Amino acid sequence: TRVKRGYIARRRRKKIRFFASSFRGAHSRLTRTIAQQKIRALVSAHRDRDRQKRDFRRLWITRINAAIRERGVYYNYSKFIHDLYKRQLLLNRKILAQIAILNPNCIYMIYNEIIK
Amino acid sequence: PEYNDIINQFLPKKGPPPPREEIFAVVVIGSRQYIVIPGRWIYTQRLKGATVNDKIVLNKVLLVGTKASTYIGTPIVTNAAVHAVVEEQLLDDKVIVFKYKKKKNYRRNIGHRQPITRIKITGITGYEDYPAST
Amino acid sequence: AVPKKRTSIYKKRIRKNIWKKKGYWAALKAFSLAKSLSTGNS
Amino acid sequence: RIKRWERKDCKPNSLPKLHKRHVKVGDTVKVISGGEKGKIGEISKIHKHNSTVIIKDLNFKTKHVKSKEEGEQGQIIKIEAAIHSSNVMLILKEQEVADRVGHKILEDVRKVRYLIKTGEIVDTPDRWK
Amino acid sequence: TKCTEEWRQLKEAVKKEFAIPHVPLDQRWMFTLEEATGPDIWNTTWYPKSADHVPTDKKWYVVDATDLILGRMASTIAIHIRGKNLASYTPSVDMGAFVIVVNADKVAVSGKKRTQKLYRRHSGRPGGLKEETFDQLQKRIPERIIEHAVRGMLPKGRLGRYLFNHLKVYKGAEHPHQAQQPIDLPLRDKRIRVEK
Amino acid sequence: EPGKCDEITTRGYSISMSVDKARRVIDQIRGRSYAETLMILELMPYRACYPIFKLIYSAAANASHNKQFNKANLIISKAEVNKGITLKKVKPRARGRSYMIKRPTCHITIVLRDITHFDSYDKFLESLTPKKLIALLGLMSTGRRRELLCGR
RNA sequence: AGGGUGAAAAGAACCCCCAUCGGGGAGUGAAAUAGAACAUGAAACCGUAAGCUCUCAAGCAGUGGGAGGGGGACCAGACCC
RNA sequence: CGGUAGGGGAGCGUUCCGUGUUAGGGAGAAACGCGUGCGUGAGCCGCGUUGGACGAAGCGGAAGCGAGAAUGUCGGCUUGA
């Protein structure tokens, strides 16, 4: 019972190639190099999904800081966050920063009535 | 007449897509905040116990807004409770998790489709509390 | 002496296209002569 | 092409092999199978090694005969073709019916090929008896 | 050519107009929600559309650098070029203002920096390192001193070059950008002006 | 559909001629007048031209006989040169080692094209944009409209 | 080392380019996107055509974010380049 | 519930056999190339084009049964040009 391989090889290497078919140069069209590269692509994806969570937060913090410094001359992000928790107020950084963009009136309003 | 007809039939023109109440809120669901406005849908974590078509009220509304917006002193405004309807509980698009280590023959590939839920917001119940906005 | 890798692709295209442009120049010149062939030349 | 593998199978003693066959040349036959079904003709030439007979005027087949010698037109000669014995069958022309052939020993010493269904003899044509 | 060109342009205008009428685009000021209600701007972090940040609409600033601190000024300048100034910040794009510096040759520096500080450029040769002092260079080309201090604080990379151009240093007091009405620059620091 | 009868694919092939040396010549005549092309190919300084010239003239004669349209109308639309069937001689070299030299071949193809077949239809669409003459529900706007197919 | 035109050679009369080779019409055939280098015809490699896009850039070439542009004879906050 | 050597458990496919000269198939099988289905994965499953006759399951069985590395090996085709 001789068993030729035939079908089973490139039916998977097509699927391997389906990933890399946006890649630039040799990486897109060379079997074993595609196989080497796909892995690395997936690894960089998995790695950067966790970088995502901290990096968006880090952007938001900068946005909020930039927004809040335009009020009083000496008022600053660090103080602002502790002033939120002093009054018991569970707005997360995403919302705060995005309202700071899309409706600065509302940040003015939150800033006004947190101080007292 | 004919001039106004055929062209009108072929290339159209758009109307202001709905009435809209235009009064936004900020809800907390799966330990995760969302700006939420009525007549409008959202994706969330799969709500354990929720049916396919089944209306619900979200009682964690940390903010409301309009012409005269209204923050919160504590958490939740007080008796404000957002009114919504569950649509469907389909799974998310596949995220490929891939463990890899260099040279150790340790390639380990594993998909993951997190179950989510689609919900449609019907209306914000009015606040009647702490009017800010100057 | 010897090449370290192959140029492989894209670079070889860039190299060949200039050579084909040599051909283009010759074509222009040969086109110009055909009008000279028509009428006069004494 | 001629095709190299597909030729007369030589025996051990350098001679091609042949098939007994129900049919002979001085014979009228109806076609059972193929494109020309039901048509009634005669056998003319008979290729033994293939089991293929040649019926006169039946396999109507065009041929573009190119001019052999001079600068002239040639012409499209519509010729016959071969046809396999299994497809043809032996017609009576009394009841005008097909058959399946069988042998019998007659009072006249010779052995002959009668039919089934109006079992009438088919053995007094060509060289003859 | 002419016939087919005009006809093509008549179609290009119409197809341009067909899309311009498909979903519309604000500026800043604004209120959270509107009668757009297309893709979710609200639960997806803001990212600027080119329609916003065009180079004409950008603010301007002027710094008179006389009797100042070189580094302390430069940090604020860098900030105001980046856009960390503005709430609408984005690391990937420049949404920051311009800066104009005047009396760059009268900028001040603490300690014994007027002699001891060296500015080095290396030609790119086996010999040529050329090293000259703060004051020696200031006598010749004072523009650099501010310019060099600023470029060191801007993010080096494809963007770093583009948004460097926005700095405009000058030798003297007067500047040729009266057309733009460049306003005065705000200055977070106590040490920023020199003791005198 | 947009053409189909605006052409005749004469494909003279197995020409004993390297593909790159054929692409020197054929890259110049991709989209020219046929008259002009012939004037070029006889004066050009290349071995490459002769078999190309033969195929251009054969293609144009073919077009004039078979489909019966004017040689003064037509142009060279798609010229294309592909790899043929390679032959391999094994030549000797110094010191006993041996290397191959190849006799390369080619497959040349030329698609000619009449300018003015679908001109009656195209010149009629000098009619300016907001027109939509809705006669047969949509009808025959099938003649290289060229600029857009924005028909949503 | 070098098998597989078709069921049947029906293997292309005639016309055109033309010294040949070969090609396009015609004709045969179920099919000639089966023409003898002929059956299914993958990859590398070589092109041709269309959509976007690089000439102050620095790059194991991907990945997360995504400006601006383009769609698919099927009206999507959806999807693809 | 990190994991190299390494041990244990649970699977997917490959060709062939029993069931089966099964139904499914010249109103289109095997193949070949594409999928805005599915699965933890190996893989599965529907599609109408090219293709022109083979041949799924399910329950079982057996191996010339899975490849990227061997200065592997045979064939093709590059680079240097």
CSV table of N, CA and C (backbone and C1' of nucleotides) in Angstrom, one decimal, chain F residues 8 10-11 14 23 30 54 57-58 61-62 65-66 78 81 85, chain G residues 15-20 22-25 36-37 46-49:
chain,number,residue,atom,x,y,z
F,8,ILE,N,-7.6,41.6,-33.8
F,8,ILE,CA,-7.3,40.3,-34.4
F,8,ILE,C,-5.9,39.8,-33.8
F,10,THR,N,-3.1,37.9,-34.0
F,10,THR,CA,-2.1,37.2,-34.7
F,10,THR,C,-0.9,36.9,-33.7
F,11,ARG,N,-0.6,35.6,-33.6
F,11,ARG,CA,0.4,35.1,-32.6
F,11,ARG,C,1.5,34.2,-33.2
F,14,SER,N,7.4,30.6,-31.7
F,14,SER,CA,8.6,29.8,-31.8
F,14,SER,C,9.7,30.5,-32.6
F,23,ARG,N,11.9,42.3,-26.3
F,23,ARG,CA,11.3,43.3,-25.5
F,23,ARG,C,12.0,44.6,-25.6
F,30,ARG,N,4.2,49.2,-28.5
F,30,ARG,CA,3.0,49.0,-27.7
F,30,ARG,C,2.2,50.3,-27.7
F,54,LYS,N,7.7,41.2,-39.8
F,54,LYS,CA,7.0,40.1,-40.5
F,54,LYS,C,5.6,39.9,-39.9
F,57,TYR,N,3.2,43.1,-40.2
F,57,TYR,CA,2.7,43.1,-41.6
F,57,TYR,C,1.7,42.0,-41.9
F,58,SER,N,2.0,40.8,-41.4
F,58,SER,CA,1.2,39.7,-41.6
F,58,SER,C,-0.1,39.9,-40.8
F,61,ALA,N,-2.2,42.6,-42.8
F,61,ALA,CA,-2.8,41.9,-43.9
F,61,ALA,C,-3.9,41.0,-43.6
F,62,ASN,N,-3.7,40.3,-42.5
F,62,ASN,CA,-4.7,39.4,-41.9
F,62,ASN,C,-6.0,40.1,-41.6
F,65,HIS,N,-7.8,41.4,-44.8
F,65,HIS,CA,-8.5,40.3,-45.6
F,65,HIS,C,-9.7,39.7,-44.8
F,66,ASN,N,-9.4,39.2,-43.6
F,66,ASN,CA,-10.3,38.4,-42.8
F,66,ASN,C,-11.5,39.3,-42.3
F,78,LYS,N,-2.1,45.5,-27.8
F,78,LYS,CA,-1.4,44.6,-26.8
F,78,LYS,C,-0.3,43.9,-27.5
F,81,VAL,N,5.4,39.4,-25.2
F,81,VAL,CA,6.5,38.5,-25.5
F,81,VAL,C,6.7,37.6,-24.4
F,85,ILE,N,10.5,27.7,-25.6
F,85,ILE,CA,10.9,26.3,-25.3
F,85,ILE,C,12.4,26.3,-25.4
G,15,C,P,-6.7,28.8,-53.2
G,15,C,O5',-7.0,30.1,-52.3
G,15,C,C5',-8.0,31.0,-52.7
G,15,C,C4',-8.4,31.9,-51.5
G,15,C,C3',-7.2,32.7,-50.9
G,15,C,O3',-6.9,33.8,-51.8
G,15,C,C1',-8.5,31.8,-49.2
G,16,C,P,-5.3,34.1,-52.1
G,16,C,O5',-4.8,35.0,-50.9
G,16,C,C5',-5.4,36.3,-50.6
G,16,C,C4',-5.2,36.6,-49.2
G,16,C,C3',-3.8,36.8,-48.6
G,16,C,O3',-3.2,38.0,-49.0
G,16,C,C1',-5.1,35.5,-47.1
G,17,C,P,-1.8,38.0,-49.8
G,17,C,O5',-0.8,38.0,-48.5
G,17,C,C5',-0.7,39.1,-47.7
G,17,C,C4',0.1,38.8,-46.4
G,17,C,C3',1.5,38.3,-46.7
G,17,C,O3',2.4,39.4,-47.1
G,17,C,C1',0.5,37.1,-44.9
G,18,C,P,3.2,39.3,-48.5
G,18,C,O5',4.0,38.0,-48.4
G,18,C,C5',5.0,37.7,-47.3
G,18,C,C4',5.4,36.3,-47.3
G,18,C,C3',5.8,35.7,-48.6
G,18,C,O3',7.2,36.0,-48.9
G,18,C,C1',4.3,34.2,-47.5
G,19,A,P,7.8,35.7,-50.4
G,19,A,O5',8.0,34.1,-50.4
G,19,A,C5',8.1,33.4,-51.6
G,19,A,C4',9.0,32.2,-51.4
G,19,A,C3',8.7,31.3,-50.2
G,19,A,O3',7.7,30.3,-50.5
G,19,A,C1',11.0,31.8,-50.2
G,20,U,P,6.9,29.7,-49.3
G,20,U,O5',8.0,29.1,-48.4
G,20,U,C5',8.0,27.7,-48.0
G,20,U,C4',9.1,27.4,-47.0
G,20,U,C3',8.8,27.1,-45.6
G,20,U,O3',8.4,25.7,-45.5
G,20,U,C1',10.5,28.7,-45.6
G,22,G,P,5.5,24.6,-39.4
G,22,G,O5',4.6,25.7,-38.6
G,22,G,C5',4.9,26.1,-37.3
G,22,G,C4',4.7,27.6,-37.1
G,22,G,C3',3.3,28.1,-37.2
G,22,G,O3',2.5,27.8,-36.0
G,22,G,C1',4.6,29.5,-38.5
G,23,G,P,0.9,27.5,-36.1
G,23,G,O5',0.3,29.0,-36.4
G,23,G,C5',0.5,30.0,-35.5
G,23,G,C4',0.2,31.4,-36.1
G,23,G,C3',-1.3,31.6,-36.5
G,23,G,O3',-2.1,31.9,-35.3
G,23,G,C1',0.1,32.3,-38.2
G,24,G,P,-3.5,31.3,-35.1
G,24,G,O5',-4.5,32.2,-36.0
G,24,G,C5',-4.8,33.6,-35.7
G,24,G,C4',-5.4,34.3,-36.8
G,24,G,C3',-6.8,33.8,-37.3
G,24,G,O3',-7.8,34.4,-36.5
G,24,G,C1',-5.4,34.1,-39.2
G,25,G,P,-9.2,33.7,-36.2
G,25,G,O5',-10.0,34.0,-37.6
G,25,G,C5',-10.8,33.0,-38.2
G,25,G,C4',-11.2,33.4,-39.6
G,25,G,C3',-12.1,32.4,-40.4
G,25,G,O3',-13.4,32.5,-40.0
G,25,G,C1',-10.2,32.9,-41.7
G,36,A,P,0.3,22.0,-32.7
G,36,A,O5',1.1,20.7,-32.6
G,36,A,C5',0.8,19.8,-31.5
G,36,A,C4',1.0,18.3,-32.0
G,36,A,C3',2.2,18.0,-32.9
G,36,A,O3',3.3,17.7,-32.2
G,36,A,C1',0.1,17.0,-33.7
G,37,A,P,4.8,18.1,-32.7
G,37,A,O5',5.5,18.8,-31.5
G,37,A,C5',5.7,18.0,-30.2
G,37,A,C4',5.5,18.9,-29.0
G,37,A,C3',4.1,19.3,-28.6
G,37,A,O3',3.9,19.1,-27.2
G,37,A,C1',5.4,21.3,-28.9
G,46,C,P,11.2,36.5,-12.4
G,46,C,O5',10.7,36.5,-13.9
G,46,C,C5',11.6,36.5,-15.0
G,46,C,C4',10.8,36.4,-16.3
G,46,C,C3',9.8,37.5,-16.6
G,46,C,O3',10.5,38.6,-17.1
G,46,C,C1',8.8,35.4,-17.0
G,47,G,P,10.2,40.1,-16.5
G,47,G,O5',8.6,40.1,-16.5
G,47,G,C5',7.8,41.2,-17.1
G,47,G,C4',7.1,40.6,-18.3
G,47,G,C3',5.8,41.3,-18.7
G,47,G,O3',6.1,42.4,-19.6
G,47,G,C1',5.4,39.0,-18.5
G,48,U,P,5.7,43.9,-19.3
G,48,U,O5',4.1,43.9,-19.7
G,48,U,C5',3.7,43.7,-21.1
G,48,U,C4',2.2,43.4,-21.2
G,48,U,C3',1.3,44.4,-20.5
G,48,U,O3',1.1,45.6,-21.1
G,48,U,C1',0.6,42.1,-20.1
G,49,A,P,0.9,47.0,-20.2
G,49,A,O5',-0.6,46.7,-19.7
G,49,A,C5',-1.7,46.7,-20.6
G,49,A,C4',-3.0,46.3,-19.9
G,49,A,C3',-3.4,47.2,-18.7
G,49,A,O3',-4.0,48.4,-19.1
G,49,A,C1',-3.7,44.9,-18.1
